[PDB]
């Protein structure tokens, strides 16, 4: 069903993917737990804590090469604003490796990404921290497009005290066309640049800290 799903993404600019596809084997539930626990190890860089690492997919190679460099710049002392690398235990997790393969194989079946070019596969580990006096928000705060032509948003975990963090789709900034709320681990939303998207701020009306753990898998060309 990848053909009709890929075609749907190309026509709409976005696609909802349910988490059941990554939850077929019973062992995946324990692998998910291990991936989820790594988000308590992310070090703080205010509203959110994140880690970044990237793979290189050379044109004819079936393999993924973890770049020793993790510099991120954005289309836009302390100029580079470099981030910590993703823990090895997270990248070696077979569930994480299987997710990126799905993301990579799906990306290659779009007309957006060509298989005759060197691709950078970006992995963004983000933990949004929300507090009663300090809600979490992104930059940009409203509707926007990501630098990378294809982006996968995978929910990893969501505190029961969290409010917000809903995803918006807009063909243009004058009106919202779709409202998607990720609730279960591994629910997935794929973004293209044909539409703007946004994430609603994360809040809590509780005395404890609310969190929203997400994994971004982006696809862009090298140099």
Contact residue for Hg ion among 31, 56, 112, 206 (CB under 5 A): 206
- Using DSSP's 3-state secondary structure scheme, residue 223 falls into coil
How far is the C-alpha of 212 from the C-alpha of 111, rounded, in Å?
32
Q: What are phi and psi of 100, to 5 degrees?
A: -65, -30
Q: How many CB atoms neighbour CB 145 within 10 A?
A: 17
Residue nearest to Hg ion (CB): 47
Contact residue for Hg ion among 60, 63, 205, 223 (CB under 5 A): 205
The answer to whether residue 146 forms part of the interface with Fe ion (CB under 5 A) is: yes
The answer to whether residue 47 forms part of the interface with Hg ion (CB under 5 A) is: yes
Between residues 38 and 146, which has the closer beta carbon with respect to Fe ion?
Answer: 146
State in angstroms the smallest separation of the CB of 138 from Fe ion: 7
Between residues 104 and 136, which has the closer beta carbon with respect to a second copy?
Answer: 136
The region of 17-25, 88-96, 101-109, 145-153 touching a second copy under the rule CB under 8 A is: 17-25
The region of 2-10, 56-64, 90-98, 150-158 touching Hg ion under the rule CB under 5 A is: 90-98
The answer to whether residue 71 forms part of the interface with Hg ion (CB under 5 A) is: no
Footprint of Hg ion on 91-110 (CB under 5 A) = 91-92
Q: Is 146 annotated as a binding residue?
A: yes
DSSP string across 14-63? EEEE-GGGG--STTHHHHHHHHHHGGGGPPP---EEEEEEEEEE-TT--S
The answer to whether residue 63 forms part of the interface with Hg ion (CB under 5 A) is: no
Between residues 109 and 132, which has the closer beta carbon with respect to a second copy?
Answer: 132
How far is the C-alpha of 43 from the C-alpha of 28, rounded, in Å?
26
How far is the C-alpha of 10 from the C-alpha of 110, rounded, in Å?
7
Find the helix packing angle between 94-108 and 2-12, rounded to 10°. 70
Footprint of a second copy on 28-87 (CB under 8 A) = 29, 32-33, 37, 40
The answer to whether residue 148 forms part of the interface with Fe ion (CB under 5 A) is: no
Q: Are 147 and 220 within 8 A, CB to CB? A: yes
- The residues facing 190 across adjacent strands are 15, 152
Quote the Cα angle for 194-95-5, to 5°: 30
Q: Are 14 and 169 within 8 A, CB to CB? A: yes
How far is the C-alpha of 201 from the C-alpha of 194, rounded, in Å?
23
Point out which residues bind Fe ion (CB under 5 A): 146
Point out which residues bind a second copy (CB under 8 A): 18-20, 23, 29, 32-33, 37, 40, 130, 133, 135-137, 141-142, 158-164, 166, 168, 173-181, 183-186, 200-209
Point out which residues bind Hg ion (CB under 5 A): 47, 88, 91-92, 184, 205-206
């Amino acid at each position: 069903s990848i053909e009709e799903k890929v075609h749907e993404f190309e026509s709409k600019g976005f696609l909802e993917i349910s988490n059941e596809i990554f939850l077929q084997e019973e062992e995946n539930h324990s692998l998910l737990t291990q991936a989820q626990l790594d988000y308590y190890n992310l070090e703080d860089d205010e509203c959110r804590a994140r880690s970044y690492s990237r793979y290189i997919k050379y044109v004819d190679s079936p393999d993924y090469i973890l770049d020793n460099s993790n510099d991120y710049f954005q289309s836009k002392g302390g100029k580079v604003r470099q981030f910590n690398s993703i823990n090895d235990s997270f990248l070696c997790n077979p569930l994480i490796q299987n997710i990126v393969r799905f993301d990579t194989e799906f990306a290659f079946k779009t007309n957006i990404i060509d298989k005759s070019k060197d691709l950078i596969i970006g992995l963004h580990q983000v933990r949004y921290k929300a507090t009663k006096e300090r809600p979490s928000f992104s930059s940009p705060i409203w509707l926007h497009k990501d630098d990378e032509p294809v982006v996968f948003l995978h929910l990893m975990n969501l505190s029961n005290t969290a409010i917000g963090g809903d995803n918006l789709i807009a063909n243009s900034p004058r009106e919202i066309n779709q409202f998607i709320s990720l609730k279960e681990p591994l629910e997935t939303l794929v973004f293209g640049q044909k539409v703007f998207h946004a994430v609603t701020p994360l809040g809590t009306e509780c005395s404890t800290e609310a969190f929203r753990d997400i994994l971004l898998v982006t696809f862009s060309y090298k140099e």
